Design an enzyme around this catalytic site. Structure first.
Site, mmCIF file in Angstrom:
data_model
loop_
_atom_site.group_PDB
_atom_site.id
_atom_site.type_symbol
_atom_site.label_atom_id
_atom_site.label_comp_id
_atom_site.label_asym_id
_atom_site.label_seq_id
_atom_site.Cartn_x
_atom_site.Cartn_y
_atom_site.Cartn_z
ATOM 1 N N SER A 200 -5.698 0.596 2.209
ATOM 2 C CA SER A 200 -4.226 0.436 1.828
ATOM 3 C C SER A 200 -3.366 0.733 2.918
ATOM 4 O O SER A 200 -2.285 0.464 3.155
ATOM 5 C CB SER A 200 -3.847 0.898 0.343
ATOM 6 O OG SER A 200 -3.956 2.361 0.621
ATOM 7 N N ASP B 244 -4.411 8.233 -0.425
ATOM 8 C CA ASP B 244 -5.303 8.577 0.561
ATOM 9 C C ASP B 244 -5.161 7.667 1.857
ATOM 10 O O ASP B 244 -4.833 6.571 1.672
ATOM 11 C CB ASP B 244 -6.658 8.735 0.184
ATOM 12 C CG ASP B 244 -6.919 9.548 -1.274
ATOM 13 O OD1 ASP B 244 -5.961 10.117 -1.425
ATOM 14 O OD2 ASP B 244 -8.196 9.616 -1.593
ATOM 15 N N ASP C 299 -7.556 6.034 4.091
ATOM 16 C CA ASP C 299 -9.026 5.725 4.481
ATOM 17 C C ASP C 299 -9.260 5.636 6.207
ATOM 18 O O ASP C 299 -8.280 4.801 6.776
ATOM 19 C CB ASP C 299 -9.428 4.421 4.128
ATOM 20 C CG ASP C 299 -9.414 4.326 2.417
ATOM 21 O OD1 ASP C 299 -9.135 3.385 2.152
ATOM 22 O OD2 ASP C 299 -9.473 5.349 1.851
ATOM 23 N N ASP D 281 -9.369 10.549 3.688
ATOM 24 C CA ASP D 281 -10.823 10.335 3.290
ATOM 25 C C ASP D 281 -11.690 9.986 4.671
ATOM 26 O O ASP D 281 -11.265 8.753 4.958
ATOM 27 C CB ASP D 281 -10.862 9.256 2.352
ATOM 28 C CG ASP D 281 -10.342 9.559 0.927
ATOM 29 O OD1 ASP D 281 -10.248 10.821 0.577
ATOM 30 O OD2 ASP D 281 -9.823 8.670 0.267
ATOM 31 N N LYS E 56 -1.122 -4.695 -6.769
ATOM 32 C CA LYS E 56 -1.814 -3.524 -6.992
ATOM 33 C C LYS E 56 -0.960 -2.682 -8.152
ATOM 34 O O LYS E 56 -2.028 -2.196 -9.121
ATOM 35 C CB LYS E 56 -1.620 -2.601 -5.666
ATOM 36 C CG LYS E 56 -2.564 -2.959 -4.649
ATOM 37 C CD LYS E 56 -2.441 -2.242 -3.299
ATOM 38 C CE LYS E 56 -2.993 -0.645 -3.290
ATOM 39 N NZ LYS E 56 -2.160 0.200 -4.024
ATOM 40 N N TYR F 218 -8.125 -2.854 -12.259
ATOM 41 C CA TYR F 218 -8.296 -2.163 -10.893
ATOM 42 C C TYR F 218 -9.430 -0.785 -11.155
ATOM 43 O O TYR F 218 -8.941 0.040 -11.560
ATOM 44 C CB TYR F 218 -6.869 -1.590 -10.456
ATOM 45 C CG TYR F 218 -7.053 -1.360 -8.970
ATOM 46 C CD1 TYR F 218 -5.980 -2.273 -8.283
ATOM 47 C CD2 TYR F 218 -8.058 -0.417 -8.271
ATOM 48 C CE1 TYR F 218 -6.000 -1.707 -6.779
ATOM 49 C CE2 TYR F 218 -7.599 0.058 -7.105
ATOM 50 C CZ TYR F 218 -6.849 -0.987 -6.368
ATOM 51 O OH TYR F 218 -6.807 -0.662 -4.836
HETATM 52 MG MG LIG Z 1 -9.425 5.480 -1.086
#
Ligand SMILES: [Mg+2]
Length: 508
Positions: A86, A97, A99, A151, A212, A221
């Site tokens: 995202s 978060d 990624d 993450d 989303k 989701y």
């Molecule tokens: Mg994530």
């Protein structure tokens, strides 16, 4: 143009003034509902990423020096951060978060990531929390660093240097990589491709922000429980963007619900022709692979090697997704005809009102946050299997898993109290007999809504099998002084109030 996809556009007509007005309304509703973070929060993320790149270089350098390389070769070894998902798509929100993938040259091992890079993080004053999980599907370190959740995964290339200029689009980079390194590269390769496959990225981003929000509110989701996750939702939006290259996002959403509600499942959603490449791995292909034929609502990743991102979809969750598509058609049509608002589209699900019966699944742990995260993760990971067993039973009309476990923790001195927790929880009739309040006992509870079509019917066998399965995964599980697992069948009138927000009131 790949940007128009594999079928050519449905319409190249541009947005009208009225459509752009609906689009402005859509964006204002996204803002009202907190979709966008502040400029300051974005700056803060950019700063942490500069630091992560610095540390990724330092990590590769240190490992290189430990393997007796000269300073120059250790510098040359490089090391580089990429983002995916995202944040990289620009559809992240205040909570989101990042990624993050750390790409390292061939001499830097996964062991090195969990020791040297992990230590580099722990030496930083900005590090708030750290939770290494060297076991996950993609081995991972989850951190909070200057207040931002990151993450972190690692991929080892089969080359001696990782220069700052490196891009991952060249499928030759995949040669000689182990399964985990392939997995690790896949996220970033797919995100990058999705961006190159849509005609107008900012139209795509606003549409995806809306989907989303819609998917989270409507409880469709959660990849772990058989619903599309973020990448699948991103690809479904991308497909519709290609069909209407000059449309506004509001129009993309209307066309999205229609097209996907009417789509000929299991025919796949594909963003570009399926590529071949230099590996011996299977690419998604229902003609020749029986597992691929079994996918109910296939949404196929564009980056070599193509795979189905929605393999977890079940008979029951398919019905829920399609139902939600139909609601979306109705509502967006009404918004276009000025009868309903965008806020109407994003109204929260009524999962806990819509069934007469629910199966509660509660994972208990008495110990550290770590073994509970591991235990619940395990139990959570098997819930979709229970859904597939329940949904094929003769008496069962649907077995609808909720998308988010309800989490709880407690003051548990004895030993006795853990026993008392396992007893009074899950039913509104006996729940009030809790407190205080809230050494600790953890709870994760998943719910499956049940619709049944001489009554009953008997679900105890799949339930017992599920419990035995979760206990089997190691001797500890397994115990009972620490790890425990409960399944409870409840009427809707009797659901615990954890399940309703201070905004709804319980049925009876
Ligand atoms: Mg994530």
């Amino acid at each position: 143009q790949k940007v128009f996809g594999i079928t050519g556009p449905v319409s190249t007509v541009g947005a009208t003034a009225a459509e752009n007005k609906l689009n402005d309304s859509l964006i204002q509703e996204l803002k009202k509902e907190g979709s966008f973070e502040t400029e300051q929060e974005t700056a803060n993320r950019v700063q942490v990423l500069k630091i992560l790149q610095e540390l990724a270089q330092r990590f590769v350098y240190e490992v290189s020096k430990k393997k007796n390389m000269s300073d120059g070769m250790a510098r040359d070894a490089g090391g580089k951060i990429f983002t995916y998902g995202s944040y990289r798509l620009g559809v992240h929100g205040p909570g989101s978060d990042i990624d993050t993938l750390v790409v390292v040259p061939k001499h830097v091992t996964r062991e090195d990531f969990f020791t040297v890079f992990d230590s580099l993080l722990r030496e930083r004053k900005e590090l708030d929390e750290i939770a290494p999980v060297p076991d996950a599907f993609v081995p991972i370190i989850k951190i909070k660093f200057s207040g931002i959740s990151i993450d972190l995964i690692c991929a080892r290339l089969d080359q001696p240097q990782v220069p700052l200029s490196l891009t991952l689009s060249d499928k030759n980079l995949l040669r000689n990589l182990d399964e985990k390194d392939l997995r690790a590269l896949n996220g970033t390769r797919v995100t990058d491709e999705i961006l190159e496959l849509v005609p107008k990225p900012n139209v795509f981003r606003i549409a995806l922000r809306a989907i989303k929000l819609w998917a989270q509110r409507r409880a469709v989701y959660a990849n772990i429980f058989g619903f599309p996750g973020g990448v699948a939702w991103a690809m479904l939006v991308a497909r519709i963007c290609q069909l209407y290259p000059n449309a506004c996002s509001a129009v993309i959403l209307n066309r999205f619900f229609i097209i996907l509600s009417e789509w000929n499942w299991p025919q796949p959603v594909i963003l570009k022709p399926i590529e071949d490449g230099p590996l011996q791995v299977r690419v998604w292909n229902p003609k020749i692979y029986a597992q691929d034929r079994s996918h109910r609502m296939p949404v196929i990743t564009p980056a070599y090697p193509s795979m189905c991102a929605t393999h977890n979809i079940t008979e029951s969750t398919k019905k829920v997704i399609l139902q939600e598509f139909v609601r979306g058609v109705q509502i967006t049509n009404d918004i276009f005809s000025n009868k309903k608002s965008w806020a109407n589209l994003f109204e929260k699900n009524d999962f806990f009102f819509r069934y007469k019966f629910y199966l509660e699944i509660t994972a208990y742990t008495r110990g550290s946050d770590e073994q509970h995260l591991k235990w619940s993760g395990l139990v959570e990971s098997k819930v979709r299997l229970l859904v597939m067993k329940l949904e094929v039973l003769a008496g069962i009309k649907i077995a609808h898993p909720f998308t988010k476990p309800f989490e709880s923790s407690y003051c548990c001195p004895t030993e006795d109290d853990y026993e008392m927790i396992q007893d009074k929880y899950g039913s509104h009739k006996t729940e009030t007999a809790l407190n205080a309040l809230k050494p600790k006992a953890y709870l994760s509870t998943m719910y499956i809504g049940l619709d049944f079509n001489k009554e009953k019917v008997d679900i105890h066998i799949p339930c017992t099998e599920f419990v035995n399965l979760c206990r089997s995964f190691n001797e500890d599980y397994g115990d009972h002084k620490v790890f425990n697992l409960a399944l409870r069948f409840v009427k809707g009138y009797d659901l615990p109030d954890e399940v309703f927000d201070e905004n709804e009131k319980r049925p009876s």
